[PDB]
């Protein structure tokens, strides 16, 4: 239950404002930015500020503070999911979202905030359907905005019939400095790119553990999906009965399912870092990167960020394979390796100076955080098995898939 969706910017001037209820005054937004500066300059920052009896829910995009006030017992999960869906609608019209798009597209952004929300209750936010009666270039609203299938305008025609999948893994890791592994979870995201003709009914079938157990095949390779979060398009009752994933797809790119499973197997890339930090003199980094994964797959463009001290100087970098740039904007040495085969072990030795007069404040210890990307290689072992195109028209479509492992927050705590 939002009251007034604003768009602020980094100074406190309103790029665009649009109140829905009138239960919050319009000059309450001028009280936002001093309250945020006050709550941030004492460390009590929160997404829910408080100016008397008006609460400021807000998210912070690139330049934008999409503040949306309320007054009552506001449904905060609804307000924040609506703010990130406003961010996604703007970024699907305007390919970046900065101040240079809000002051140029007030023809269409007031129409969007007219359309998305009424009285505080979000009602039509699927952008691929919203591109059909709110344009920057009006007819009747489509029957998609009415009907139960509210994400797919009927009558889409392509010459070819291609369904592109992307079973993109994302290994999380958080290795404590003693050497043991704390949280090693994997967040996959099957991210489709659909190009079909009509109103199809796909039936995606994974190698889900509960499906292989209800069938009777509980001794082969089966991924154990701990929690699965689907898109809207997946009918969830049929998924809850017998683990069948049936969905009428949208047209374009979206995130079909976002699974998450834990893993008690070794990390993929392991970073044994030491630090010879003499006080007032220098520091050394005999960091080695052993690739625990299979010998066949090649970790494209790993970037082992390694946090140096803030004021280090005059570096030296004896590596084995791969360039080292010292990035002092971030105070880290981004040790890049382009082709990093599985089973190898590449060693690096940085060497800095250090200022002789000591610092004034302490700095903290950020983690070594790699940026790896191993294609054709699923860590959890999920295998897509089929994708049944069902269409009343009747045709042979061409499904496709590829496999990527990435990093999630692949961090490793330091000395």
């Amino acid at each position: 239950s939002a009251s007034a969706v604003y768009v602020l910017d980094l100074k406190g001037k309103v790029l665009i404002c649009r109140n829905y209820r009138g239960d919050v005054d319009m000059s309450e937004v001028e009280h936002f930015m001093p309250i945020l500066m006050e709550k941030e300059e004492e460390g009590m920052l929160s997404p829910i500020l408080a100016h008397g009896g008006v609460r400021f829910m807000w998210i912070k995009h690139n330049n934008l503070y999409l503040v949306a006030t309320s007054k009552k017992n506001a449904c905060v999960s609804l307000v924040f999911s609506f703010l990130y869906k406003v961010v996604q609608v703007f970024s699907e019209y305007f390919k970046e979202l900065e101040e240079e798009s809000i002051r140029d597209n007030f023809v269409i952004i007031y129409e969007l905030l007219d359309e998305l929300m009424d009285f505080g209750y979000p009602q039509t936010t699927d952008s691929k359907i919203l591109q059909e009666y709110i344009t920057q270039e009006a007819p009747r609203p489509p029957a998609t905005v009415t009907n139960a299938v509210s994400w797919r305008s009927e009558g889409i025609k392509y010459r070819k019939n291609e369904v592109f999948l992307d079973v993109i893994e994302a290994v999380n890791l958080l290795v404590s400095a003693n050497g043991n592994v704390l949280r090693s979870e994997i967040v996959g995201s099957i991210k489709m790119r659909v190009f079909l003709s009509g109103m199809p009914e796909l039936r995606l079938g994974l190698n889900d553990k509960v499906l292989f157990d209800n069938t009777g095949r509980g001794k082969s390779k089966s991924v154990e999906l701990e929690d699965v979060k689907f898109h809207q398009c997946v009918r969830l009752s049929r998924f809850e009965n017998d683990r069948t994933i049936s969905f009428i797809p949208p047209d374009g790119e979206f995130e079909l399912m976002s699974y998450r499973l834990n893993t008690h197997v070794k990390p993929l890339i392991w970073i044994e870092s030491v630090i010879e930090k003499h006080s007032h003199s220098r520091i050394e980094y005999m960091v080695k990167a052993k690739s625990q994964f299979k010998r066949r797959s090649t970790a494209n463009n790993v970037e082992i960020h390694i946090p140096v001290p803030n004021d280090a100087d005059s570096p030296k970098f004896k590596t084995t394979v791969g360039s080292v740039k010292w990035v002092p904007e971030n105070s880290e040495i981004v040790w890049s390796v382009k082709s990093f085969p599985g089973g190898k072990e590449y060693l690096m030795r940085a060497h800095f100076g250090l200022p002789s007069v000591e610092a004034e404040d302490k700095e903290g210890k950020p983690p070594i955080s790699v940026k790896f990307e191993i294609p054709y290689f699923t860590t959890s072992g999920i295998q897509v098995r089929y994708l049944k195109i069902i269409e009343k028209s009747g045709y042979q479509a061409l499904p496709w898939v590829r496999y990527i492992t990435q990093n999630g927050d692949y961090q490793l705590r330091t000395q």
């Binding site: 999948l165 897509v384 098995r385 089929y386 994708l387 195109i389 496709w400 898939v401 590829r402």
Partner: peptide, 13 residues
């Protein structure tokens, strides 16, 4: 997307 895809079966009933 620089990488390449792999065709998955249709029916598998």
């Amino acid at each position: 997307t620089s990488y390449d895809y792999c065709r998955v079966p249709m029916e598998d009933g």
